Design a binder for this molecule. Structure first.
Ligand SMILES: O=C(Nc1nccs1)c1ccccc1
Length: 167
């Protein structure tokens, strides 16, 4: 049993809810919250900007030190950093950004990072300002992630379309 409430069950291991991932993280304090990161861990907008704002910029300060030591992530890659006030850990995952011309086949590689964690609160990778089709992102998620993933979808209209169209 876990703390996640109000989710619709899509599969054995994937759950979905219309929710603000920031507000959900603050309520649940999950072991792992996933960030929709870029390779520079520059948390300007979208899910990343919202998560970072909720940490009062502490996520960005920690991220800048990580990049200064390690250099940029790979598209499709990830790193584990603090969850600050939102979670124990933040898994920063880089999905391909269609608005930069990145290979959408890298979306499966991105979701494979989730399999290193038994339970996660996450957004749909490469959705929103990363430009991918969220219906496609949900299909890759279901077909790639084997661990237990609780997906937060900010937009109510999109949430209803994802559920209604789910095969
Ligand atoms: O945003 C999209 N679909 C949405 N439906 C409801 C709210 S947003 C999208 C983005 C890229 C390619 C195809 C579709």
């Amino acid at each position: 049993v876990n703390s996640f409430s109000g989710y619709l069950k899509l599969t054995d291991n994937v759950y979905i809810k219309n929710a603000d991932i920031v507000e959900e993280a603050k309520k649940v304090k999950p072991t792992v919250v996933v960030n929709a990161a870029n390779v520079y861990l520059k948390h300007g907008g979208g899910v990343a900007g919202a998560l970072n704002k909720a940490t009062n910029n502490a996520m960005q300060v920690e991220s800048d030190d990580y990049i200064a030591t390690n250099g940029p992530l790979k598209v499709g890659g990830s790193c584990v950093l603090s969850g600050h006030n939102l979670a124990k850990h933040c898994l920063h995952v880089v999905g391909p950004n269609v608005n930069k011309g990145e290979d959408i086949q890298l979306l499966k590689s991105a979701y494979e990072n989730f399999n290193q964690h038994e339970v996660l609160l996450a957004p749909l990778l490469s959705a929103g300002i990363f430009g991918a089709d969220p219906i496609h992102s949900l299909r890759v998620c279901v077909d790639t992630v084997r661990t237990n993933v609780y997906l937060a979808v900010f937009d109510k209209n999109l949430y209803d379309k994802l559920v209604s169209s789910f095969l």
